[PDB]
Design a binder for this molecule. Structure first.
Ligand code: NA
Ligand code: NA
Ligand code: NA
Ligand code: NA
Length: 125
């Protein structure tokens, strides 16, 4: 798997690829990295999160969060410091998207469920 430093480098690249497309600012982005997710973000932040999950190949053509490739991702890619938190969060949070129709809401609120469940060391790009 990746080391923590390699994962950070990969997450910074994802953020560089996605953030410029959306009307987001540094503070709210720093917040998600530190696993602090607003309950009521504006739409641009929700779609930033979707862009990210899409980029990590965790999103479906249907505009849904894919359990199976997320698991494969986590297994192959994550360092021990993140891997067990991510597996537990995915199982804990897998039904979140069913309360939402819009794909940006599915992505963002699934990631919020994960952020809220885990401690502050669980990073999002
Ligand atoms: Na590595
Ligand atoms: Na919550
Ligand atoms: Na967290
Ligand atoms: Na938390």
């Amino acid at each position: 798997a990746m080391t923590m430093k390699q994962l950070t480098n990969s997450m910074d690249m994802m953020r560089q690829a996605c953030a410029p497309k959306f009307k987001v600012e540094e503070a709210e982005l720093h917040g998600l990295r530190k696993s602090i997710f607003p309950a009521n973000p504006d739409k641009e932040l929700k779609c930033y999160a979707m862009c990210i999950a899409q980029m990590a190949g965790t999103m479906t053509k249907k505009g849904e969060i894919s359990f199976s490739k997320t698991m494969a991702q986590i297994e192959a890619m994550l360092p021990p410091e993140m891997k067990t938190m991510a597996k537990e969060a995915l199982t804990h949070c897998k039904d979140t998207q069913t309360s939402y129709k819009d794909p940006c809401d599915k992505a963002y609120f699934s990631a919020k469920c994960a952020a809220d469940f885990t401690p502050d060391t669980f990073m999002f790009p």
